[PDB]
Amino acid sequence: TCPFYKKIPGTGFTVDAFQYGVVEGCTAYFLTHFHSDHYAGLSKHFTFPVYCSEITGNLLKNKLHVQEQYIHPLPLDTECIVNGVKVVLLDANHCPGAVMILFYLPNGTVILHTGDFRADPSMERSLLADQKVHMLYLDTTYCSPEYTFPSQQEVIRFAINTAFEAVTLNPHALVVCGTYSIGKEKVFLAIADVLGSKVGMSQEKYKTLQCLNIPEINSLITTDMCSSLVHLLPMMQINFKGLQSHLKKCGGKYNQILAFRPTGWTHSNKFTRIADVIPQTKGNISIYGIPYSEHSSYLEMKRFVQWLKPQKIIPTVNVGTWKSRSTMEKYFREWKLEAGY
Ligand code: NI
Incomplete structure (x- = not known):
């Protein structure tokens, strides 16, 4: 009831x-x-x-x-x-x-x-x-x-710097960002902006974003995955199996994935500063858990x-x-x- x-x-x-x-x-x-x-x-x-x-x-x-x-x-x-x-x-x-x-x-x-x-x-x-x-x-x-968690600003700084550095070292690296609902758009948009790319995503997701009255959205997102080096995928797919799979799909345009999982809180927050976050890495795939909270x-x-x-x-x-x-x-x-x- x-x-x-x-x-x-x-x-x-x-x-x-x-x-x-x-x-x-x-x-x-x-x-x-x-x-x-x-x-x-x-x-x-x-x-x-x-x-x-x-x-x-x-x-x-x-x-x-x-x-x-x-x-x-x-x-x-x-x-x-x-x-x-x-x-x-x-x-x-x-x-x-x-x-x-x-x-x-x-x-x-x-x-x-x-x-x-x-x-x-x-x-x-x-x-x-x-x-x-x-x-x-x-x-x-x-x-x-x-x-406890950092400001949203500190977290975005971390992500931007991480991504810019990785892709400047390796121009064949792909960045992937996970999502399962609206919210946290700043993550993937800030990264795309520093790399001079549009964010590529499914048609259903592009539809969702077009509902949000974000200024200049047509300039920042696209359903053409090929022309993009920031891809959005379901949060479910943000794991080693899911990312190895996605990488196969790109047809040797890319040789490395850097992926972000913006989570609410994780117990690494009690100990670890933002400056002190490290990824989980397997092969040519790295996954960063970042504490971007909207609560x-x-x-x-x-x-x-x-x-x-x-x-x-x-x-x-x-x-x-x-x-x-x-x-x-x-x-x-x-x-x-x-x-x-
Ligand atoms: Ni909510």
């Missing part, structure tokens, strides 16, 4: 609740972003209003074939009225089109639902600064102190919450075990006592 943490009290609204069939008494279904655990259940047969960002609206229309009369895209940073309730969509710093949602209840409660987000100090100068939030529905993906680290999350000072926190991630739940509630209490709210 629809869980309580996907329901907005005092409204007929749900958030990311498309896999439960008809949710009793739901008058508007909000979608934070186009990732499968969140959209699961949408299709061309959905006949209720869906509210979302313009980019997420493009992906519903073109990838899932949701009919246009049920898609209600909203501009960001703009006060809008949905079924008589004032709402604002804010940038979530997650994947393209990902939003957080501010609900202004008739009775005067203000509710922020983060969707998936990577908290950042820039959010402290959005519309959020202008009024108090009583309840926070928080993306708690990495809510434990062991989760908040524990410290980023803690700062955002201590800044916002909500009266109640509702976790949306890692809620399935008692030990998880109970550990998160302990951190919330530490944060609150340390900051004085």
